[PDB]
Paper text:
BMAL1, CLOCK and their paralogs all belong to the mammalian basic helix–loop–helix PER-ARNT-SIM (bHLH-PAS) family of transcription factors, where crystal structures of their bHLH–PASA–PASB segments have been described in some cases. In the present study, we focused on the BMAL1 PASB domain (referred to as BMAL1(PASB)) to identify a ligand and evaluate whether the pocket could be leveraged to modulate BMAL1–CLOCK transcriptional activities.
To visualize how CCM binds to human BMAL1(PASB), we used crystals of this protein for X-ray diffraction studies, resulting in refined structures at 1.83-Å resolution for the ligand-free (apo) state and 2.16-Å resolution for the CCM-bound BMAL1(PASB) complex. In the apo structure, the central cavity houses three water molecules that interact with each other and residues Tyr340, His344, Tyr404, Ser436 and Asn438. Comparison of the apo and CCM-bound structures reveals overall and locally induced changes. When looking at the details of protein, repositioning of several side chains and shifts in portions of the main chain can be found. Induced repositioning of those and other amino acids by CCM expands the volume of the resident PASB pocket three-fold.
Author numbering: 336 to 441
Write the structure that this text describes.
């Protein structure tokens, strides 16, 4: 359904993929999120633990589940999300290119 959407994030949080279900949940067009960092939208209280879970997943092929956190939507209010993250290691270049994130409304 449309209670979740999938994003991908480069190493500074930059959105590099946003599926169209994000607009239903966040009221942003995908193009508004693409090229901006997820950290720009996290509630400032949540930056620290989300950044540490992001750092964790860069060093493992296992998935990491965040705590619930608040995400600032287009009108400036906050919704609560929980994300499941895993990193995408290129098996030839041996580089983590991005992380995959399923973002679920709580």
């Amino acid at each position: 359904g449309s209670m979740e959407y999938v994003s991908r994030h480069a190493i500074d949080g930059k959105f590099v993929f946003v599926d169209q279900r994000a607009t239903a949940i966040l009221a942003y067009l995908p193009q508004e999120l693409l090229g901006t960092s997820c950290y720009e939208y996290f509630h400032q209280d949540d930056i620290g633990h989300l950044a540490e879970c992001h750092r964790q997943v860069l060093q493992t092929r296992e998935k990491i589940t965040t705590n619930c956190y608040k995400f600032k939507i287009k009108d400036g209010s906050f919704i609560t999300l929980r994300s499941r993250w895993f990193s995408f290691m290129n098996p030839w270049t041996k580089e983590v290119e991005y992380i995959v994130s399923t973002n679920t409304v709580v």
